[PDB]
Amino acid sequence: LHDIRDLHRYYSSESFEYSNVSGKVENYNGSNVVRFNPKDQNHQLFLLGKDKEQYKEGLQGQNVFVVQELIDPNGRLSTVGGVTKKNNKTSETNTPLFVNKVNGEDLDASIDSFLIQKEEISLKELDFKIRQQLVNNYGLYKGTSKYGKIIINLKDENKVEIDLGDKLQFERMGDVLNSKDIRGISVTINQ
Amino acid sequence: TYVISAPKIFRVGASENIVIQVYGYTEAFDATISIKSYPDKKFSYSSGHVHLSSENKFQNSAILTIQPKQLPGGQNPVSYVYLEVVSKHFSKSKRMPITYDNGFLFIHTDKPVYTPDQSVKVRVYSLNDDLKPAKRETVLTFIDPEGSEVDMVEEIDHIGIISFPDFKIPSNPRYGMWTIKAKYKEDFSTTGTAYFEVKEYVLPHFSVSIEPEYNFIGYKNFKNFEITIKARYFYNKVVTEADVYITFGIREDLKDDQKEMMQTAMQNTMLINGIAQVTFDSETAVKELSYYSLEDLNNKYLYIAVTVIESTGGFSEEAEIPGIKYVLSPYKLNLVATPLFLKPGIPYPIKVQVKDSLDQLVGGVPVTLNAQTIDVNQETSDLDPSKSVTRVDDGVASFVLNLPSGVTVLEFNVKTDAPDLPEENQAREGYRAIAYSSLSQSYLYIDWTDNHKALLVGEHLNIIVTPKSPYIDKITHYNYLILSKGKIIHFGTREKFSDASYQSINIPVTQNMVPSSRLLVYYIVTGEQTAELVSDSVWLNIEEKCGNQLQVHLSPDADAYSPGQTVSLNMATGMDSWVALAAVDSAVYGVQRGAKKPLERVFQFLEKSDLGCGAGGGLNNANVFHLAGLTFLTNANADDSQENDEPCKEILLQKKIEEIAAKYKHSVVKKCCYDGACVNNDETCEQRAARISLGPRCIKAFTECCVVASQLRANISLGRLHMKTLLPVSKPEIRSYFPESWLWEVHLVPRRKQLQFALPDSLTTWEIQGIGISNTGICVADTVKAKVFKDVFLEMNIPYSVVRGEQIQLKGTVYNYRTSGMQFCVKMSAVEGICTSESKCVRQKVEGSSSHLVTFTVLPLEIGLHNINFSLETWFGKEILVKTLRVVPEGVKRESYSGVTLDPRGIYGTISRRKEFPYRIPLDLVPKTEIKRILSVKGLLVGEILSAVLSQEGINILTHLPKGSAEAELMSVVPVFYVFHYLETGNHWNIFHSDPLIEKQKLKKKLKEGMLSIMSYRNADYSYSVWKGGSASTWLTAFALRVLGQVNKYVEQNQNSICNSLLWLVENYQLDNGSFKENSQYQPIKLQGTLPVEARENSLYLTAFTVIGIRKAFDICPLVKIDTALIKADNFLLENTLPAQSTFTLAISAYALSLGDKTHPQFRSIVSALKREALVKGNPPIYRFWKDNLQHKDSSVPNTGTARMVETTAYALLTSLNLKDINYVNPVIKWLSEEQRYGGGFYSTQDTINAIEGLTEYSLLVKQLRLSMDIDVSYKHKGALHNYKMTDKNFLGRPVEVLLNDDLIVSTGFGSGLATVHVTTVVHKTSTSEEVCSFYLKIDTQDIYKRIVACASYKPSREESSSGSSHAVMDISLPTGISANEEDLKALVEGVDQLFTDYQIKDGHVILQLNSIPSSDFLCVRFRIFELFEVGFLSPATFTVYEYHRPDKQCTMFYSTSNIKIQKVCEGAACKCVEADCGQMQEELDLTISAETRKQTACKPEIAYAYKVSITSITVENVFVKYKATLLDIYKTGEAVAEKDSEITFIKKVTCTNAELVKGRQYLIMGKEALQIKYNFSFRYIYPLDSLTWIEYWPRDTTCSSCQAFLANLDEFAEDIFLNGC
Ligand SMILES: *[C@@H]1O[C@H](CO)[C@@H](O[C@@H]2O[C@H](CO)[C@@H](O)[C@H](O)[C@H]2NC(C)=O)[C@H](O)[C@H]1NC(C)=O
Ligand SMILES: *[C@@H]1O[C@H](CO)[C@@H](O)[C@H](O)[C@H]1NC(C)=O
């Protein structure tokens, strides 16, 4: 969908997370669509990850990192992925995580950290906090800052990347991750 | 080339940051690092596969991390490891030291000063190397002010706010500087430390203030310093005459409990009208008086402390100023981010920075800068001096000198040129700078500017890289490197601008840099010969921005609150966080809360993990990297770090006696002379010297200095004379209390949380602080003071107790705190049994921000009766305060000997299903006073001892016995220990209907807090000692061991202590026969015998006793050396008992062996001896016990038990109980479990522990017996009182006060088990004449104001030695409202001449304790007493003196504190009430001794006037109403309307047969003001005419029935009042 102004507005938003929520499927168009009464309105949730083809049945009280992607006037908000196990262990890992700013021949790098507050964590939620942090502490989405690649480590030979040039990853936002597995994140920003 | 940076040290559990970055060509290439162990590259704890490339500019990072491996204690493990890196192109590693310090321990005691018995709140904030929660298990260990441990405890770390258990300050603690240390349970050397000070609270008599000329001393004054002290009572009325004693002293600091006082510290400038002053010539007052001869030599403290003793009452009040810094120069220079190394060709900068003696910045000071230099050519240069001036906004005075390339070392001095500062006191500093030596001729210089003292996070640092010099410019890239909190966090590379020299590097300041950081910047220079790394570096101080902004707020943000207001408090954070509230009485800190900082307190500390040092920049690329905090890994330059490592530190007439200290040769002799002269006129010098024990070494020091000061008092000097030489003896007293803290809860605040509550009813400024910790780190928030307070309020001072028909004066003061004054009107509520002046709204005026005395006279006839409502009225307030009045009778004996053992099943020798306790009224009973008596029925022989520990909280003594001894502190742990022992060792925990596991926690506790209680009496050598600071007693050491050994079963006691405590007796105090000598003079028992016999006996008694102790406790320190001793000891006893001298002696001897080998033939002999000695009641034995004597069978067992009786028989019972002698013992315990009194062991202490142990240990040895009686308590003639089914469910039922006047009858059904009935009956008698006097007494009140002189002599019992008593106490009841002279008594016990060893004023009783009361003659205490209030027909208190361990020796005597006669008649009380309170007309004529009584009866604040007048109207006619008189002259203006000449009436009704004013005569009048009935259609005021009005004839007779000598004084008094004012 691509742009610099927007990517600074969506990832600065108010995130939310929920649990004990069980529901029963209905397909809006393609394959799915859901809803839940949070205590103040009535939301919606779009399942369409590779993990959804295993869950066209419904939700048994899972954890849903419900951050809004778009909204209806009644306060209900559409969202994609973000679901996790529940009972979700309240583990708290302090993960390595680097950040190198490219400026052609220049590089302002910094070693840092990320706090994973769970046992299993949704790549949506993983990506939302991985960018929320860059936006507020590494000059992301403000000027020449908008292109780059997040290399999550997971084992000696694996990595899950996320272009920063666009948030077009609706379908893997279903993918889920083992907290203790992640060896160390490493970002590189090209301005 | 490659560069691989990393810290100078590693840390275990530490995520060690290691950048790698390199100049390799295009070919990307892998890079793995890891941690490997000294010379064998075998162990590799961790590593990292971090692959650089031209994409990552060939730079990367890894979190290695050395966890726990080598754990062997002793092996010097871990010392040194190997850093390693790996690639395709090279491999390299390093030997570099490491450490066990990981993280930070932060000890948050709630407040920093405590008083005996407060409970220290505590928690610990703990972080790791990464300033994150750091969960771990931690362990602290409180350390008394003498540096022995005293406790310990670990706890689990759920979040980072470890919450420990409160630490109760001892009843009578070791006063002074406490220390709490804390260490990580597991591995990690990291240390926390904290402190608190335990000071001894004392009640203040009157506010003494002390204010110093200024807050520092500076050259200006130093020949003088106007110290003004100002004394005043709480009743808004300044002290008048007073005696002032100010003593000074130097001081290193304000964490120094000690400070070298100084002789010739001015005495007496007698306070006078609320002020005195003296200036203090510091020059004089230090020179010969210390190492301090130049003021120069002195930038430490001056200590001031006054003692203001009130002249009238004779009270006393102390006050101090901790310190007052001395100052040479009122500014202080310190360089500011100006590195001490010169790069050459670059001009060297030198920003100095001036500050005042208060550490604020001060601008506009001129500052000269002389500097000095030598060439590399070894030539010097004496620079020309420059001067600049200190900026205004900056505080900085910036220089720059341009340095000849060939410069090397520059040396600079820097000073202020204050034009009005004299040269001396100008402020100066010196520094030295040295050149970055580099043979490439190459150097580097980086700087940056920003106009403010702190880089705000979010800002962007433009920093100027000037490579100047390097023979060449072939620079490829500049590379930087930024550390913070011991860790590299950023690193990078800017391409060098091919053309020009310098460019800028722009680093964002990041939140990771937050407390500070350093950066270092290097280019790699290819000299033709060898590759040169080169770099400089700079320390970057940045803003104390938090990670989690926690901010607390009060709901009503108002700056003052109501004492009770409900009010919501709010938490705040930008990220979910842990909080941690606390609400301290802000007053602790208070007095100049030194600026320093609040949240910087932590930041300062928490960033000494900054490994680096200096303002920046090294000396070699090494050094540069070194001071950075780094050592690096780069083959080219020597990454070296010259040996060891850089302990860096802050580069980034009484004087005539006082000369006779000339006999110093030990401290104790100082004290010897010092308190030697003190002030003792009731006995000779050598009478006092006699009582001296400490050592004939100081006896001279005593008699010498004493005579010196005795003849002197004849020469320095009404009859007021009182020598002195102050020295608080270095005791931390503290005349102000500080309330327990609150809101000490943790909380989980996700960005918000609000938690209402109403704050405590109390005048306190609650500073409510609140730190928080979360994944960002630690962030203390800006405090939030919340003073509560009520505008105007009254307090009434009720006494402890008053006797029936004593007329009492009930004072109080009413508090105005409003800025303006106002009108009140306090009225007291007539409660049924209390007489009063109303059949009233006496509205007064309170001056603003002050207080008006109030008073009432009352007089109760109904005993015990309580309750009096008090009220006051103000325009906008009407408030009611309730109070309750203890009323009593006269001379109190309680006779308890009644009891039964309910035995329905005859187990014990017969069937007990009834005992009748009847009325027996002793013909000495005080009229109209009922006979109280209590009934305490319980199952189990061990049931009193159970009810006592599980019905009252907090450990408690089991008698009325006074707390002075260490012995009383020990005896407190006892009843819990035995209870817990019987509870646990016979599993009975199922007694509890409740949760037993937690009822058990409680007792472990009670047991511990009580165990520490004793520590104050633990000496330094591990020897305990009878009273505090008293010479080690061999005796109490044993007994302490005994009780310690005992409690070790269930609460482990410190082994090492117990060893040395044990090793003390045996190595020093066991004679070459195996017997034990007592050290101190403490006589514990008085034994019978001849002077020789006694010593023999006495010896057994100790040796037996001290065995039982070592024996009792031996098990925690079985120690070859002390097993021998135990035997050599045991030996003596076998070899030295058996021609038995006393049954008592025998019995201990017996019980003591009993605890060893109980088959030595000889032992069996002794047990024979003993067993033969016993006696029995009824045939067969139903009761057995032993008598103290030995076969001398006077047989006076006069229907009465005895401390020693119960003692010895417990020793038999205990011996027997050992030899499972089961049957023998039954009738023995039948008689104990029917001896012990309601609650616990009645007779004294020492038996009671044994008898308890017995009772327990036997109920343990013999099986229990399921209780199931059906008791019935009932009045013989009156209807049935209660009657209840007893069972193992409840047996420790309620007591019951038997009300009615009838014979009582306990009377169980058939059933089963064993229930102990005791019935402890109290009565008051009018006389002692009956009783048996074991002490000769005398007492009376002397005038030479007034003072008590009590004496005693010990009457020896037949067979007894002439030496005099055993440890004994005298106990003086004080008459109602007659305070004793605390200081006088302190005088007696507190000196080497100590007459007593322990005083205390509890509940209206002065209570003295000493080791003996010689029969040779009398022994006299004397002390003075001040009529606290007006009592009117007071009944006498009592002067009783018994022997501590044998209370059977109670000589008791009534006495009175006044001779005042005067008659009445009075029937059943309706007499002293028909006379409300009404006034008194002093007798006609008057006796000499009155110019003092006449004045005083004036300004005494209850005197709202004093004015002479004459009756112009007392209507002779009958039925006509009250007085009215014409005023003649006003001495004290009544607070009411009318002025000199006017008439003012006087009102009173009802029969008052006690004063008749004669019309036409001029009576002088004195009392409170007149009562305003303000208005309900217009009128007046006038007065009461009460019991302290001095209505008194003014016989202006000038010649009548020959008058006189009474007019000389009223004419005297007269022209005396107005002038002396008041
Ligand atoms: C002064 O004392 C009286 C007597 O105790 C108090 O009377 C009580 O007031 C409360 C509140 O109304 C009642 O519940 C009680 O029953 C009253 N006691 C009795 C039996 O009279 C009175 O409150 C006190 N004065 C004030 C204003 O507190
Ligand atoms: C005390 O005695 C000295 C020496 O006899 C005498 O001179 C002096 O007057 C006396 N002191 C005073 C002030 O009375």
Curated annotation (Swiss-Prot), chain B:
Any GO BP annotation: complement activation, alternative pathway
Chief place of localization: secreted
Localisation per UniProt entry: Secreted
Consequence recorded when altering residue 843 to C: Risk factor for poor response to eculizumab in PNH patients
PROSITE patterns referenced in this protein's UniProt entry, alphabetically: ANAPHYLATOXIN_1, ANAPHYLATOXIN_2, NTR
Quaternary context: In absence of complement activation, the C5 precursor is first processed by the removal of 4 basic residues, forming two chains, beta and alpha, linked by a disulfide bond. (Microbial infection) Interacts with Staphylococcus aureus protein SSL5.
Function: Precursor of the C5a anaphylatoxin and complement C5b components of the complement pathways, which consist in a cascade of proteins that leads to phagocytosis and breakdown of pathogens and signaling that strengthens the adaptive immune system. Activated downstream of classical, alternative, lectin and GZMK complement pathways.
Protein name, UniProt field: Complement C5
Encoding gene per record: C5
